[PDB]
Amino acid sequence: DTKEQRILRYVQQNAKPGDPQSVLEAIDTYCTQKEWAMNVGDAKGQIMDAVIREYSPSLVLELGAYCGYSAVRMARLLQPGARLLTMEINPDCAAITQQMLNFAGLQDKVTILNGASQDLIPQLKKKYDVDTLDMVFLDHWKDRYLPDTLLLEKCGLLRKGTVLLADNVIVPGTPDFLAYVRGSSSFECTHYSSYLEYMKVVDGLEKAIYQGP
Ligand SMILES: O=C(NC/C=C/[C@H]1O[C@@H](n2ccc(=O)cc2)[C@H](O)[C@@H]1O)c1cc([N+](=O)[O-])cc(O)c1O
Numbered sequence: 001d002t003k004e005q006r007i008l009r010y011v012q013q014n015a016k017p018g019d020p021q022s023v024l025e026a027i028d029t030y031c032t033q034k035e036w037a038m039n040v041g042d043a044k045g046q047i048m049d050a051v052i053r054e055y056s057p058s059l060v061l062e063l064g065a066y067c068g069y070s071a072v073r074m075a076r077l078l079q080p081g082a083r084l085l086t087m088e089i090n091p092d093c094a095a096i097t098q099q100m101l102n103f104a105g106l107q108d109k110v111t112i113l114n115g116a117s118q119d120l121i122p123q124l125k126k127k128y129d130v131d132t133l134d135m136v137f138l139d140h141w142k143d144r145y146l147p148d149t150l151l152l153e154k155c156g157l158l159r160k161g162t163v164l165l166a167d168n169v170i171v172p173g174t175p176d177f178l179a180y181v182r183g184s185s186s187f188e189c190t191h192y193s194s195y196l197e198y199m200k201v202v203d204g205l206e207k208a209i210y211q212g213p
């Protein structure tokens, strides 16, 4: 029994089926109170929401599904006919994400791709009927942000105005990617400061009074 299955089970037990907001709130409660997990969380999630609403993307690529928290967050804001594709190398995470989307009622909008991003990116156009991407959410292994961005470009998946949105650029950090994009005339960058997810960390003092030998 994994932490990820425990999160899904908590959602099935407590959230309202077909209600994406309820699903996000159930995840946030469980991870705030019971077990830390690497979901983007509601603080950064609000920022994501504002960006998605600004750009109204028709085709979004997510790198890194995990439990589906960000896939639920994004897909609930997509217009009719818009699509999210999400890449997940861990088959256990891919299954959880699909059940989460199902529970939320968002399964029609989202396609899960099982595999490593660097292996899947070159197959997008032919296998998933993609021309260029409107938005890319990066939230997978931090050392893959830069090489995958380069591969996206190589494969002709970026157009003028494609919006890349990257989590964790301060903590744990993505320093090669951040330096690259900030220094490149091919990208115009903006930083949105927020807070790392679920950081009310419990600790305590133990008093132990010696009673004699
Ligand atoms: O390490 C972090 N994220 C790595 C994410 C990894 C996810 O991306 C998938 N994937 C999908 C496709 C691939 O090709 C590779 C991996 C993995 O199978 C996992 O589901 C992280 C860590 C902290 N932290 O505070 O420690 C906070 C965060 O917000 C984080 O995102």
Ligand SMILES: [Mg+2]
Residues within 6 Å of the ligand: 038, 039, 040, 139, 167, 168
């Ligand atoms: Mg993250």
